[PDB]
Design a protein around this ligand. Structure first.
Ligand SMILES: Nc1ncnc2c1ncn2[C@@H]1O[C@H](COP(=O)(O)OP(=O)(O)OP(=O)(O)O)[C@@H](O)[C@H]1O
Ligand SMILES: [Mg+2]
Lengths: 47, 506, 464, 464, 99, 49, 114, 50
């Protein structure tokens, strides 16, 4: 019974960690896209 | 006022020959040529060719189609008068051609039946017909769970060295049986467009097709990495032009593009060298339009237009299995279905490494023969249940009997879907193979021996009980009499099957 | 008075006009491509004024074959789409040109596709609910009349069948009309939709506007606005309630971004156009209820990278009033319309707008279904025998509740012969109240499949 | 006739010529720097024609000291390098100037550094295995004789050590000519290689061309082409088996990127030149072998930011028959040579070529290591005892296999002190078959670390 | 700023105002649009460098004036629409450092 | 470069030198600043090519 | 150590070591909790939580927020207290006692309160 | 309470003090719940919080 409770808590914690890490990964993906576009357009503006 | 009138007269004043005012990195600017049209084919003094992609009031920005170093400032540029066009005909079967239709295999010249512009519009909505006949790839995974119907666009998307070119070459090879019959309604033609591949890899693909006998109905449009960005950009449209000539004449065509990721890179290079504004990942604003215009040529024409079809198999190479990148997103949205080939599955022994699951074919059942649809219907759900239960492989002893049965069934269906390279299976053999698994006849075989048991039973049926295969091919469905005969043959064979561990099967 | 093409950079064309005749923004110009193989009449939409009487325009057709100095004739109005009851039953492109009967509609009244949303004082201040007649929608994810509804799904989950169902219901129950805006529509899928609607005999109640992917980004960006112009005509003039489908809205956003890149603008956020919110508002805010007539909209939204924080869905979802998510699991269980009762959501489902009893019943149904989903793992791995008596009772309730959310959809008539059902909302609330209180949990599970409410439930139970 | 320097910007110099005498692209121009401390003759390579008789050139030597208006003379031909048996046993720079004996090659035949790759007709796939004596390379990524081999790796993971080891293993037991191209690498590594080759008496069969990283971008772009021109002379004009080692080929593309913005090209992807694929393909396709005359090319590749998805490595992967992907993770774990068993691949690892026995063992090792990689997530957090018994035994096998893939390399005696080892291919196959079957599961893990074969494994096990 | 001007007129007249902004996230996006169309190089999350200014200049005028200036006040209730509870994002952090 | 030159003078005269560069990262930032102020188009991470 | 003294430096380094170990164990603490760690690591994490909370203090500027007046802890007392904490002399007190406490005497006061 | 509830979501049993804290928090949270468009004057707020 204690193992059931502990592993349910572990699964919930892992799900929350997955959600937080997915949010962080999406933020970093968007940041990388924006940064790459910034570099490309900065090179473009200098021609 | 009169100044404006004089300017109007001067502008309305305008062979036409221009002059190269600027050249470099595969792009040449051509002063003059007032009557040049966008994407017109320009010819330069050394026999070099270019495509007038930009037309400003000052100069024509033309991408040079290979042999670029011969261009100098002041060279006289002459216009061909016609937009990009390629020869097309039956003479291109068994030939290797650069994107302009000029052979590079070293054999004789190609007898062109006609010339097709690379930018002819795709069939309209009313000129098309529902994709309703299969294109048997010979890959059990694809033909059983992500079927490709004639007129469909199936994107083989995956990381490097994952089995994409292998899947496409197997698809091309599997059409040999349909070719030999001689019926144009079954006879499927193939065009393998290699973009940016090293020359020896194109040669190896040619060797694989020729040893497998496919080259008598397959054309290779080769734009190796050496060739200029212009060729790597035009090769898909050359292949599509050849396929379209075959398609509008009533023939069925399979177009493989390998890889569209390298066409996008070539177009990006051309556009950036042309000072076009870049977007995400430095791509020009019309890369999605590029690939859409490429793939929407693939279609199944209504019977009013001969009933021909062109099936696309665009290959795209992801990086770190990131299917959210720009080109992967564009092609996924464009195409009708996706075979996601993953390296993790490839290393685990799944071959071809298709992630059944995320991989999907929107045409679906309409692209499967009745036999496969009936036998392979339960395969997807069984594999889903197995992938959900795989975490219990350690504690199976505590599982319910039904859950254990599902786990054992899935562990054998996954083996059943494994398939060696360059060994496509005719549709009837696939039907029998999926019958072996979905009906539980593999439940008595060791998981280590499902592959060999399948192969040996298929060989046995081919050699001794060929009636089942003939029935499936002629009727397209597995009749109850044939089903009973197949079950009897399975049981007879299982008595004479030597398992790897020495066990016995009943 | 006519201009001259001076620059051709892919889809972008610059046109020089006399000093006194520069076209205004978003005007439609015609330019001839005379080359035999690619002969065309390009429609260029003016996008910017570059000065010196040059106007930069986005070509709505491929510019291959276009020649510098070719005459460009201004039409004096924006891209104008045909409007009227005559557009129903036909398929158009983003420029109003009929695709199945070319030349059709040229004599109809033509409306500019760029129109301001309804004046502020003309908007309805209270959100009225759209009683679709579908049990699952009207109970758990009530649609908002004059609102926008996300439609997640794909092939093999009956999205096309649900679209047919909504077309039928708006046509019969509300006496309305439907406009299908296929933004970024696969030509194969466009033809399949056309033939399926013709077979279902609902095309006569629907006007199709396909901005195909093979067309440049301009048409994929303006097709949504063209379809919405047709819907606005049916609303304001014909006095009909309109249901405007958009498949796919993310592709409208993507076309806007691609056009922004082509015109030279600096990308924002994740590479999207700086004016993303402005374009999304100009499109969606025209989808509203005014003067008693409403343009409801069902929009298929693609969330890139499965990321709801990406600016595309993030801006789209600021406008969507409801969400309907079709799932493979529910579809395989034989439940049509195949709406996932839990993933789908609606913002009108509050006790303030819907009745208190409605909210209570919906929340009880959601609770039962959530508990059933939680116990699904136990059922699959250990078998139903492990569940306690209370858990078995809840599972019995939930199976029948989820099967009763299924309905004999109108679109299914053609495939089955029996007429489709339209359950009044009161009947749905009462029936699900009874089901959660368990007054029917003794009936066989097969009784609740594909039935139109409560009396049909009793009759089918007596049949079994 | 002579030109005139007009604009100098780092390694890029613009030269204005008379109207009738503009040099062709890729021609070699000569300028003079007369400042005493930096006096020299500066070789420029025409890269663009800007118009109005202006050309834009990359400098093969630093432009420090160059003065505007200084005369520029046209050689009338591209940069040419000496070729012949004479180049063997000597050290050259990118321009063909001998370093260890200045003025040595001034009388040899000179070939243009730029030339088209062999026609597709002459190409034939290579399917012969090159046994090298390393366990990991021979087992998992068999090298192709006459094919193209690459050693990918992040910054400082052992590319130079491994390429030196493979020089030792292939060239030292190989009767044909060898060519080394030190493209933009550390000069100490090149000097150590030169000394080693002199001591081993292999230099006489080796021609070394160095454009090391102290050189400006132009020399790093063109040193690869110079060494490769020597290679193709040995291929086409002598029909002799050739080894072309390039360390490091990424520096060619990187040097291209350094001058990309100064040449007027807009940046692409992560700061790379738009012409990345075109240029690298032009360079790589020259390295291919043609039927009857084989170049066994072995080119290290640098992975910037230790990111294998970077455009340069990603575009280089397509030009290779065998790929040894080094990784910093394996290096940090202590498993030198630091080869990544899973990410690495070879096109000759086909049961129809290496034999079913080799293929089965290789695939079993890959499967075991992939399962171990998947399980590493669970082990670090949940623990080892919570795995399945089969998975636990597989983890033991996998750790032993990872540590057995390590090997005491001859060129890594400085890293470990102990001498190197050569493991025959059949012994490797037998050892890894046994490991996958568990006949060595009872030995400790350290018994397999840096051990060159089964006899040495037994000796180490008895020592522990 | 229109709302802030309307409120400030009353604030300096000795009256108390309450200014709400649903939502300043959409103002930041709008100003990003104007600044990018003007081709001002962007910063974090594609926002211009002075985006912080845009908000502080706005929210710094909500003040409780001294008795010498009438004692009026303007209370600001800016609304920020975070994305997935990303309270650590750029605009949320800016407006939290202003408010 | 000044430190390397001072060390190189001794190095070429037969003496052993030890150069410490705290921090080469701050040199890269300074070079980025100079290049951007000279209006060289930057590469990745805004650094000069 | 040449500036702040041997005792101060030693206590600071030990506190940093305990907190670094706690941070390294966060990866497991988040999923499985404190229960699954080794006993040495369990004790380390307990005194790490107590140290982390004892570094909290009731500042004078915080009064306007909390009402509780601020507290000043001299260097000698801080060193002694954290030496005791690292050595484990306060592992029996509840973690709640170390919130915003500022001092050994006041720590004992709050512990008696709890 | 917001953390004590999370602790109690998996704690086998709770002390009397923890039970009192949980029971008080579960009622304070319900008290702070408030219907839309129904603001409470300050006097009513203080009485309710009392
Ligand atoms: N079904 C298969 N069974 C066994 N090996 C396979 C199979 N498919 C591919 N392979 C092997 O996988 C390796 C890569 O295959 P393939 O040439 O198809 O890769 P790809 O995905 O096209 O990659 P790329 O062109 O980027 O190198 C080769 O060794 C090929 O033999
Ligand atoms: Mg491939």
């Amino acid at each position: 019974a204690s193992r059931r409770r502990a592993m349910k808590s572990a699964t919930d914690n892992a799900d929350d960690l997955i959600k937080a890490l997915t949010l962080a990964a999406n933020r970093e993906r968007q940041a990388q896209i924006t940064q790459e576009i910034s570099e490309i357009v900065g090179g473009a503006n200098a021609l | 006022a009169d100044i404006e009138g004089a300017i109007e007269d001067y502008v309305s004043s305008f062979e036409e020959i221009g002059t190269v005012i600027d050249a470099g990195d595969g792009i040449a600017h051509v002063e003059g040529l007032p009557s040049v049209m966008t994407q017109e084919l320009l010819e330069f003094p050394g026999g070099v060719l270019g495509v007038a992609l930009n037309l400003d009031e000052h100069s024509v920005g033309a991408v040079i189609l290979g042999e670029f170093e011969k261009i100098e400032e002041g060279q006289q540029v002459k216009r061909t008068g016609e937009v990009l066009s390629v020869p097309v005909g039956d003479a291109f079967l068994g030939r290797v051609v650069n994107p302009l239709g000029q052979p590079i295999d070293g054999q004789g010249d190609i007898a062109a039946e006609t010339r097709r512009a690379l930018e002819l519009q795709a069939p309209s909505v009313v000129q098309r017909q529902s994709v309703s006949e299969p294109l048997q790839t010979g890959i059990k995974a694809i033909d059983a769970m992500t079927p490709i119907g004639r007129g469909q666009r199936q994107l083989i998307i995956g990381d490097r060295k994952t089995g994409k070119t292998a899947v496409c070459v197997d698809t091309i090879l599997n059409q040999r049986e349909a070719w030999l019959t001689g019926d144009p309604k079954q006879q499927v033609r193939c065009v393998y467009v290699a973009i940016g591949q090293k020359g020896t890899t194109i040669a190896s693909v040619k060797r694989a097709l020729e040893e497998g006998g496919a080259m008598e109905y397959t054309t290779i449009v080769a734009a190796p990495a050496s060739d200029a960005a212009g060729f790597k950009w035009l090769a898909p449209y050359t292949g599509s032009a050849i396929g379209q000539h075959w398609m509008y004449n009533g023939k069925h065509v399979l177009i493989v593009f390998d890889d569209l990721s390298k066409q996008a890179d070539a177009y990006r290079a051309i556009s950036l060298l042309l000072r076009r504004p870049p977007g995400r990942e430095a791509f020009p604003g019309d890369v999605f339009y590029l690939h859409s215009r490429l793939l929407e040529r693939c279609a199944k024409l209504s019977d009013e237009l001969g009933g021909g079809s062109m099936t696309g198999l665009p290959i795209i190479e992801t990086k770190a299995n990131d299917i959210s990148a720009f080109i992967p997103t564009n092609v996924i949205s464009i195409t009708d279905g996706q075979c996601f080939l993953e390296s993790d599955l490839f290393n685990q022994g799944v071959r071809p490494a298709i992630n059944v699951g995320v991989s999907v074919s929107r045409v679906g059942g309409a692209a499967q023969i009745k036999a496969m649809k009936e036998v392979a219907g339960s395969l997807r759900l069984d594999l889903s249940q197995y992938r959900e239960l795989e975490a219990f492989a350690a504690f199976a002893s505590d599982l319910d009997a039904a859950s254990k049965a599902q786990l054992d069934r899935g562990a054998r269906l996954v083996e059943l879907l494994k398939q060696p390279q360059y060994s496509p299976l005719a549709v009837e053999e696939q039907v029998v193979a999926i019958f072996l698994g979905t009906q539980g006849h593999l439940d008595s075989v060791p998981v280590e021996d499902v592959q060999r048991f399948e192969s040996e039973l298929l060989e046995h049926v081919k050699a001794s009980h060929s009636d089942i295969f003939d029935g499936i091919r002629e009727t397209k469905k597995l009749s109850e009499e044939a089903e009973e005969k197949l079950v009897s043959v399975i049981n007879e064979f299982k008595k004479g099957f030597q398992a790897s561990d020495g066990s016995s099967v009943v | 008075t006519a201009g001259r093409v001076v620059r051709i950079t892919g889809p972008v064309v610059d046109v020089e006009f006399p000093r006194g005749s520069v076209p205004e923004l978003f005007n439609a110009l015609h330019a001839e491509i005379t080359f035999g193989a690619l002969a065309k009449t390009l429609t260029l939409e003016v996008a910017q004024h570059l000065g010196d009487s040059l106007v930069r325009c986005i070509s709505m057709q491929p510019t291959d074959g276009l020649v510098r100095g070719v005459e460009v004739t201004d039409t004096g109005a924006s891209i104008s789409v045909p409007v009227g009851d005559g557009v129903k039953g036909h398929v158009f492109n983003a420029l109003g040109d009929c695709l199945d009967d070319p030349g059709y509609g040229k004599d109809f009244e033509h409306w500019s596709i760029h129109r301001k949303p309804p004046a502020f004082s003309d908007l309805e201040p209270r959100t009225e609910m759209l009683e679709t007649g579908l049990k699952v929608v009207d109970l758990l994810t009530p649609y908002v009349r004059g609102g926008k509804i996300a439609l997640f799904g794909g092939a093999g989950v009956g999205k096309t069948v649900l679209i047919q169902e909504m077309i039928n219901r708006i046509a019969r129950n509300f006496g309305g009309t439907s406009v299908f805006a296929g933004v970024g529509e696969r030509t194969r899928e466009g033809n399949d939709l056309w033939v399926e609607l013709a077979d279902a005999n609902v095309l006569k109640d629907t006007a199709l506007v396909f901005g195909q992917m093979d067309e440049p980004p301009g048409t994929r960006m303006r097709v949504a606005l063209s379809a919405l112009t047709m819907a606005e005509f049916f609303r304001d003039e014909q006095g009909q309630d309109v249901l405007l489908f958009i498949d796919n809205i993310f592709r409208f956003t993507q076309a806007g971004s691609e056009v922004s890149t082509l015109l030279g603008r600096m990308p924002s956020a994740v590479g999207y156009q700086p004016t993303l919110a402005d374009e999304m508002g100009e499109l969606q805010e025209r989808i509203t209820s005014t003067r008693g007539r409403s343009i409801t909209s069902m929009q298929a939204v693609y969330v890139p990278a499965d990321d709801y924080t990406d600016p595309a869905p993030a801006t789209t979802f600021a406008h969507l009033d409801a969400t309907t998510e079709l799932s493979r699991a529910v579809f395989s269980k034989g439940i049509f319309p195949a709406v996932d009762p839990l993933a789908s959501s609606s913002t009108i489902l509050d006790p303030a707008i819907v009745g208190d009893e409605h909210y209570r019943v919906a929340q009880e149904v959601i609770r039962i279904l959530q508990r059933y989903k939680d116990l699904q793992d136990i059922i699959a791995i250990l078998g139903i025998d492990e569940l306690s008596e209370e858990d078995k009772q809840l599972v019995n309730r939930a199976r029948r509740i989820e099967r009763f959310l299924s309905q004999n959809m109108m679109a299914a008539e053609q495939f089955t012969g029996q007429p489709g059902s339209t359950v009044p909302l009161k009947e749905t609330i009462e029936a699900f109240d009874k089901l959660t209180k368990g007054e029917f949990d003794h009936l066989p599970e097969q009784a609740f499949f594909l039935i139109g409410g409560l009396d049909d439930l009793a009759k089918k139970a007596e049949s079994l």
